[PDB]
Amino acid sequence: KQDFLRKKLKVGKPKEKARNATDTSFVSKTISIRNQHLDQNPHDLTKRLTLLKHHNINVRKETLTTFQKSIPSIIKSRLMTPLLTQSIPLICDESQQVRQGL
Amino acid sequence: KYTGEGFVEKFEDILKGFPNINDVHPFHRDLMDTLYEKNHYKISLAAISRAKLVEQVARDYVRLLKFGQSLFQCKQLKRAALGRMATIVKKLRDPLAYL
Amino acid sequence: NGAQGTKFRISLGLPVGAIMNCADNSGARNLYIIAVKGSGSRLNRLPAASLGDMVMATVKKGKPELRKKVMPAIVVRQAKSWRRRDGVFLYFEDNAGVIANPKGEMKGSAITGPVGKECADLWPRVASNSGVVV
Amino acid sequence: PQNDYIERHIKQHGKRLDHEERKRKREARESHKISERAQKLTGWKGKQFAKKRYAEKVSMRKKIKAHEQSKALPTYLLDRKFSVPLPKVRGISEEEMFKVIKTGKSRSKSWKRMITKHTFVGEGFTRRPVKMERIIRPSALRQKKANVTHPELGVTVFLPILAVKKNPQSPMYTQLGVLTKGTIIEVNVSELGMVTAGGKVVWGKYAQVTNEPDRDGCVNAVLLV
Amino acid sequence: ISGWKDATEFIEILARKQGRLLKGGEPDESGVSKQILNDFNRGKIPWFVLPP
Amino acid sequence: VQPDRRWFGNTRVISQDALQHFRSALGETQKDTYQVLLRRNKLPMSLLARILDTESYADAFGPKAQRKRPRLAASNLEDLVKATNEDITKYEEKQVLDAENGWTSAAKEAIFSKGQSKRIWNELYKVIDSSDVVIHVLDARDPLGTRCKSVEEYMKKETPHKHLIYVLNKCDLVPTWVAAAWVKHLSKERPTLAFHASITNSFGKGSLIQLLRQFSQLHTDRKQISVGFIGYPNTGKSSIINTLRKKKVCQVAPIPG
RNA sequence: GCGUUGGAUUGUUCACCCACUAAUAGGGAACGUGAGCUGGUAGACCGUCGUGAGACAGGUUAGUUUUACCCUACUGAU
RNA sequence: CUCUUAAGGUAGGGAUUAACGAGAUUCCCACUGUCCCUAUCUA
Ligand SMILES: Nc1nc2c(ncn2[C@@H]2O[C@H](COP(=O)(O)OP(=O)(O)OP(=O)(O)O)[C@@H](O)[C@H]2O)c(=O)[nH]1
Ligand SMILES: [Mg+2]
């Protein structure tokens, strides 16, 4: 229970830093927030695409209705084959409403 | 608390009663400047304002007194607050004579 | 001060927390608040006075420009049973209120309805602004 | 008003008829009345009277002294163990340091201990949760800066404390950071511009506290050069 | 409601509508204003400040 | 306390080049609020005329008064005329700019001082001192009204090791573009999530969860991390907590207190 | 010697606010363990903890001592 | 060290939300001896 001490000389190991050498090294991580998608973008239906897997049922129904209404402006685009890929498996869905919307 | 309140009442009577040498009229301003040396005037009144410090001492030492566990401790804290007030006022010997 | 004459005694009708009428067209309808000038100091007793007594008051009903604003003025009617030192007991239909500055000078310029004899004798500008005494 | 009007009035009319005689007689009776106030004025007023009279005596003694008087090493070695200035300080009981605190509606659990004296917690303190904290170091009894004096230079400075290395009472108290008398602390000294041989700036030094800051809000200390 | 002027008139319109009036015919302006001020904060009345 | 040659010695040393580089990097780092230092305890943060000598209050004014002429003297005598006219014009201007008879205004009701109290602010400072993170809840109707800048200044000066983020709440009451505008305006300084509090229909829950577990990953040594909720009354602190837990944990009411 | 107020405020008051006033001075006889009258265990809920029974860093709510006719003192009466 | 976070508000109509209760609480009208400030009467 001393106020000053040494480990030992410890032959073989790196020597040491003496007693008072200041260590000016650090690391600074940067925080990352979500975007939250509060501002309308042209790529907005690509985000509603995945709501066809939503655990809720009215969500899926209203999403299918939105995609129904947005057909003529997207019929020739990079979104239609993923739309059908992600919506075809709703044939085995639990709801007459969603099957009818499809 | 009473000792603090007395000092700040006194100092407030000085600060509010005395005029603001700026903010009055240019004629009176220049007259009182050539009479009393505006710089000295403002400096003295600023000294009194900054001394009105006493509030800090009173608040700090009261908040310390909340944890007093003995008559001797509480007495010494009281004495300390009043002594620091006295030091502040002792450093106000010349401005009050001027004022 | 402001009044002309002595502190004379007529019975008390108007304690603190009493809404009384204003009938002049300065804008107010009502007068409430705390204070009575020349009131004593006794434990548990209410400040209540008349004798053309000056009191602090606010407009409970009236124009917003003078609502929210404390003001002095003078009792002119009481509706309690007062005694004249010349004979009979007097009393009015109602209480009445009305407005002034600390010197006794009125914000309004004319009074409706009767005003008390002793109130007018004590306050000159009330007697000038009143067309009807008693 | 308007100027020194009473000075003008004294020049024009003049002070009274019975002014100089009365002033002379007041100055004469003052000798009697001084002693009268001494044998009277019971209490604080007599105490203050005696204080004033003693100070006045000393002033006149010094004045007369000044009147009547106005009527081997070299320069560089003039002005000149490793023991600290305070070994063997008063010992503090654990009872006098820790206050008991009781918890519950029916207060029956105590298990909590409030440190009564001034403390140094650190820079990133961040209190523990209440169900998990046992040691309580209240915010008012938490010091960041001390009043450190260099014995040389006759100078003091309000320096920020960096650490507590040795409180002589029960080195638990060092880890708690209790600033009792005789406690040894690391303080920053960058304001003084000290530099070692090599050009490395010194920014930390040992100091020993000289006061009992539980009685005074001040933490006064002496540098160990 | 509709088409008011004069918030003093607004209150009396709303009181005559809600049947919120005193013994007589004086519409209770005080309680109606209290309810309006509760609605304003609680979000029954939509309102918002614009930023720069 | 025994003698030792290890007292009286320099205990903490640093070279000038390392010192200056360390100053520069941290001046870069700690101006950015999205950045955060990891340890913060092993690091040195501590490394980051007068006329009375001439005139003695007594030669200026008094019976002694060794002061006959000024030093506040303009030459070219017309110059002080140019000054006096300018000063009179400025004076008359201030008069009409800032532009009594024996009536007063009624007392302020004692209910308007309810947020202000020793009892409440003791709880505030207790919560902060116990917290590792401080969320500042704002109403999207009036965030700058509901901001409380003095607490942020206190947290800057006193406690830089705390994190101090913003949460816009009641975003369901205003349009989406107002919320986006405010979030853009405030993300410049502080992260500033948007939120809507409800046990059933919520918004921002997962984002806030992600941010809190980020701070947890940073404070890996503390064994737990405390998050205080600061703000005006009736902003939704209790409702945000009830939203995170997804049941009624804290009492809630539309009345403030 | 004689007086030293009326009120607002329980998201609380070891206090402050505005008025009236001649003034709105401080204290004791209880609080140097514990003593008029009035606000501030058993049931139940939320929170923290606990494997649990339960406990508490908490918080909210409801919730039965009942003299004098005895001696003395005091007040009046034979 | 890296990047995904699908407790994503489906929409900017997303929360303006019964009746009942010797349940806990605040305010208003009316009303009064609760109060100023006590007085009187009956068994
Ligand atoms: N529309 C909407 N209302 C909210 C939201 N959050 C809270 N509220 C409402 O705001 C009312 C008062 O806010 P509180 O939840 O009490 O927030 P608080 O005042 O910080 O809570 P306390 O700490 O208990 O005082 C609640 O009764 C809620 O009904 C929100 O996100 N959207
Ligand atoms: Mg609230």
Chain F nearest-CA distance from C67, in A, is: 9
Q: Is B61 helix (H, G, I), strand (E, B) or coil?
A: helix
Residues of B in contact with F49 (CB under 8 A): none
In a domain, C107, yes or no: yes
User: Ligand 2 centroid to E20 CA: how many Å?
Assistant: 29
Q: Is C115 helix (H, G, I), strand (E, B) or coil?
A: strand
H5 closest protein residue (CA to C1'): F210
In a domain, C117, yes or no: yes
In a domain, C59, yes or no: yes
Distance between CA atoms of residues C98 and C118, nearest Å: 15
Return all residues near F135 (Cβ < 8 A) that are at least 6 apart: F165, F166, F167, F227, F228, F229, F230, F240
What percent of chain C is helix, strand and coil (3-state, nearest 5)? 10, 20, 70
Distance between CA atoms of residues F41 and A23, nearest Å: 12
Distance between CA atoms of residues A85 and B81, nearest Å: 80
Region class of D74: left (phi > 0), else alpha (psi between -120 and 50), else beta: beta
Considering only the beta carbons, identify the residue of F61, F70, F88 that sits closest to B98. F61
Both tokens of residue E14? Answer: 């709303």
Both tokens of residue A33? Answer: 């927030």
CATH number for the domain harbouring residue C74: 2.40.150.20
| Beta carbons of D224 and F7 less than 8 Å apart | yes
Beta strand D145-150 with D220-223 is parallel
- Mark out chain A residues that contact chain D at CB-CB < 8 A: 1, 3, 20, 22
| Beta carbons of A26 and F180 less than 8 Å apart | no
In a domain, C4, yes or no: no
Considering only the beta carbons, identify the residue of F178, F185, F254 that sits closest to E48. F178
**Which of F234, F245, F251 is the best mutation target for the ligand 1 pocket, counting ligand atoms within 8 Å of the beta carbon and taking the most?**
F234
Q: Is the dihedral of CA D34, D39, D42, D48 positive or negative?
A: positive
Is the CB of residue C48 inside 7 Å of nucleic acid strand G? no
Chain D nearest-CA distance from F189, in A, is: 22
Nearest CA, atom 8, ligand 1? F236
Domain around C46: 13-134
Closest CA to F218 of F32, F23, F31, F40: F40
Q: Which residues contact ligand 1 via a Cβ below 6 A?
A: E 43; F 169-170, 172-173, 196-197, 233-239, 250, 252-254, 256
Distance between CA atoms of residues A6 and F244, nearest Å: 51
Chain B nearest-CA distance from F101, in A, is: 21
| Beta carbons of F70 and B38 less than 8 Å apart | no
Residues that place a CB less than 5 A from ion ligand 2: F 233-234, 256
In a domain, C54, yes or no: yes
Resolution for this model in angstroms, one decimal place?
3.1
DSSP assignment of D64-100 equals HHHHHHH----TTTTT-----S--SPPPPPHHHHEEE
User: Phi, psi at residue F196, to the nearest 5°?
Assistant: -145, 130
Distance between CA atoms of residues A37 and A59, nearest Å: 18
| Beta carbons of A38 and F4 less than 8 Å apart | no
User: Count H helices, E strands: chain C?
Assistant: 2, 6
Is F150 annotated to bind a ligand? Reply is no
User: Ligand 1 centroid to E44 CA: how many Å?
Assistant: 14
In a domain, C7, yes or no: no
In DSSP terms, which residues pair with D146 in a beta bridge? D159
The nucleotide lying nearest F174 (C-alpha to C1') is: H12
Q: What is the 3-state secondary structure (H, E, C) of chain F?
A: CCCCCCCCCCCEEECHHHHHHHHHHHHHHCCCCCEEECCCCCCCCCCCCCHHHCCCCCCCCCCCCCCCCCCCCCCCCHHHHHHHHHHHHHHHHHHHHHCCCCCEECCCCHHHHCCCCHHHHHHHHHHHHHCCEEEEEEECCCCCCCCCHHHHHHHHHHCCCCCCEEEEECCCCCCHHHHHHHHHHHHCCCCCEECECCCCCCECHHHHHHHHHHHHHHCCCCCCCCEEEEECCCCCHHHHHHHHHCCCCCCCCCCCC
Region class of D212: left (phi > 0), else alpha (psi between -120 and 50), else beta: beta
Interchain contact F3–B (C-beta under 8 A): no
Distance between CA atoms of residues F208 and F136, nearest Å: 13
In a domain, C105, yes or no: yes
Is the CB of residue A58 inside 7 Å of nucleic acid strand H? yes
Distance between CA atoms of residues A3 and D84, nearest Å: 14
> Which of residues 181-220 of F have CB within 7 Å of strand H?
196-198, 200-207, 209-210
Quickly give F191 CA vs H18 C1' distance in Å: 42
| Beta carbons of F103 and C58 less than 8 Å apart | no
User: Phi, psi at residue F212, to the nearest 5°?
Assistant: -70, -40
The one-letter code for the residue type at B91 is K
> How crowded is the C-beta side of A95, counted as CA atoms within 13 Å?
14
C94 within 8 A of C107, measured Cβ to Cβ: no
Residues of C in contact with F106 (CB under 8 A): 33, 58, 68-70
In a domain, C5, yes or no: no
Q: Which atom of ligand 1 is nearest to the CA of F234?
A: 19
F103 within 8 A of F196, measured Cβ to Cβ: no
**Which of F135, F137, F170, F252 is the best mutation target for the ligand 1 pocket, counting ligand atoms within 8 Å of the beta carbon and taking the most?**
F252
First-last CA distance in chain C: 24
Number of domains chain C contains: 1
Quickly give F214 CA vs H21 C1' distance in Å: 48
What percent of chain B is helix, strand and coil (3-state, nearest 5)? 80, 0, 20
Distance between CA atoms of residues F127 and F135, nearest Å: 11
Interchain contact B42–F (C-beta under 8 A): no
Return all residues near D81 (Cβ < 8 A) that are at least 6 apart: F3
| Beta carbons of D87 and F1 less than 8 Å apart | yes
